[PDB]
Amino acid sequence: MDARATIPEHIARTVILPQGYADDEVIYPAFKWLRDEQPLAMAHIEGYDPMWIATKHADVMQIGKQPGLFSNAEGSEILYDQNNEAFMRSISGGCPHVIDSLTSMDPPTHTAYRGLTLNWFQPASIRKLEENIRRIAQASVQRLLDFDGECDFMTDCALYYPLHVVMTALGVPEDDEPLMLKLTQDFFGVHEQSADEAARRFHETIATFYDYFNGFTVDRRSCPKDDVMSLLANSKLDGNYIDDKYINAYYVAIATAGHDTTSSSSGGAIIGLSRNPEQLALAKSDPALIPRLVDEAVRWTAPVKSFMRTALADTEVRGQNIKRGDRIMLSYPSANRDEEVFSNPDEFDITRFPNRHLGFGWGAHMCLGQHLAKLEMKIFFEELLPKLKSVELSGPPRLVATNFVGGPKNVPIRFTKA
Ligand code: HEM
Numbered sequence: 418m419d420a421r422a423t424i425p426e427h428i429a430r431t432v433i434l435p436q437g438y439a440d441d442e443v444i445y446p447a448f449k450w451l452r453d454e455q456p457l458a459m460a461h462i463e464g465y466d467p468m469w470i471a472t473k474h475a476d477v478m479q480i481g482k483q484p485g486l487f488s489n490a491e492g493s494e495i496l497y498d499q500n501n502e503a504f505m506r507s508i509s510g511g512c513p514h515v516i517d518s519l520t521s522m523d524p525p526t527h528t529a530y531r532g533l534t535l536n537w538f539q540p541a542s543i544r545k546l547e548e549n550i551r552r553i554a555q556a557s558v559q560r561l562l563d564f565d566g567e568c569d570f571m572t573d574c575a576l577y578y579p580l581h582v583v584m585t586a587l588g589v590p591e592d593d594e595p596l597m598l599k600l601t602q603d604f605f606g607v608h609e610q611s612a613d614e615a616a617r618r619f620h621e622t623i624a625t626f627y628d629y630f631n632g633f634t635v636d637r638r639s640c641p642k643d644d645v646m647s648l649l650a651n652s653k654l655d656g657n658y659i660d661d662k663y664i665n666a667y668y669v670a671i672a673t674a675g676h677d678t679t680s681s682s683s684g685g686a687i688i689g690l691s692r693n694p695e696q697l698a699l700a701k702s703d704p705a706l707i708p709r710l711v712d713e714a715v716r717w718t719a720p721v722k723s724f725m726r727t728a729l730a731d732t733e734v735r736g737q738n739i740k741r742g743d744r745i746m747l748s749y750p751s752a753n754r755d756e757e758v759f760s761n762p763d764e765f766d767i768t769r770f771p772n773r774h775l776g777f778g779w780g781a782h783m784c785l786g787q788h789l790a791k792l793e794m795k796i797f798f799e800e801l802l803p804k805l806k807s808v809e810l811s812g813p814p815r816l817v818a819t820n821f822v823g824g825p826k827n828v829p830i831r832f833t834k835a
Pocket residue numbers: 481519520521531583586670671672674675676678679682715719720721724749775776777778779780781782783784785786787789790
């Protein structure tokens with residue numbers, strides 16, 4: 418219906434809708450066409466707002482850099498169809514954000530709330546978790562090795578270690594694993610009963626989680642620890658504690674943001690190594706390559722498929738006239754296969770350097786957890802790879818049919834033990 422839309426319907430459907438993300442050979446050719454022919458253009462398909470599709474690495478950085486011009490707060494920062502956004506608005510007091518977490522905020526609010534934990538998540542602070550992360554990683558590796566050379570790398574291994582890491586970072590006890598899996602896999606899981614009923618279930622379930630998290634907040638105000646829950650519980654702004662709604666959103670955001678992404682990227686690494694056995698040999702003879710392996714797994718997997726922005730003023734990008742109120746989809750996968758930046762970007766190559774990928778985004782909201790993600794993946798692969806003589810896929814990987822946080826959910830493998 419919007420006269421400015423120039424992206425062919427079939428291409429627009431492929432890049433916007435969830436289904437195509439389940440197959441690399443569906444999604445990546447569509448983005449290649451856009452990068453070649455309509456690098457920044459408008460799409461409008463039935464059931465969605467009109468939107469610009471940012472397919473180029475340069476543009477995704479330019480937009481992400483300027484939160485004053487391209488907003489997280491103003492519209493939904495997640496790519497929902499109109500029906501789902503309206504449902505979200507109806508359970509969130511009219512706001513297009515289900516909780517008050519960092520990705521829902523614009524500066525200066527954003528800057529203040531991110532600032533509460535920014536230092537904790539920097540490499541020097543994160544390095545103190547090394548011993549704990551190594552214990553957690555070894556447990557997951559043992560889990561895999563307990564199989565007689567056959568398992569699902571995701572469901573039998575990679576599902577676990579990153580949740581345990583985010584739990585240790587927060588301060589959630591080991592025994593609460595079931596509740597944390599419910600949080601990230603069930604309540605905030607991918608869909609893949611009336612509206613009133615769904616809304617009732619939502620309000621009940623989130624209240625249950627927030628009651629649970631409130632107990633930690635109270636605990637840490639009397640008995641401080643070096644974990645994130647303690648940091649936030651004991652934080653003040655303008656001389657007062659942060660409201661429970663911001664604290665609990667922060668706990669949920671950290672758990673959900675840090676689990677699937679890391680698991681998925683780990684699966685991506687195993688797919689890459691399975692298809693490229695020489696690279697497994699390389700990482701085994703030179704463990705100092707593992708950080709480069711980790712960055713390549715994140716670039717190539719690109720588990721976060723999109724975030725959205727709303728233009729707050731008329732403005733120009735790649736010679737296009739973006740108008741106030743226009744929504745923009747940021748495609749991290751398309752940026753990560755941009756030929757102007759990467760040679761042979763469809764190839765998994767652990768020696769790729771430099772590797773200036775946007776798997777963690779770029780600019781004001783750039784992944785808070787990026788340093789924790791890189792450290793835990795490094796430690797995991799340091800522990801796993803010496804234990805493996807070989808690894809191969811036993812069947813096709815199954816990827817999540819989503820336009821938000823996807824990548825591998827199931828990675829059937831065979832392996833021989835070193
Ligand atoms: C391979 C693993 C991961 C990937 C690919 C990833 C990716 C991303 C991306 C793309 C964003 C949006 C950035 C932007 O708008 O520019 C983001 C935001 C965020 N990530 Fe991650 N992430 C990963 C791991 C983690 C971990 C382990 C944590 C926490 C322990 C985490 C916490 C967050 C938080 C809190 C935000 C919101 C930050 C803000 O709005 O200021 N992520 N992540």
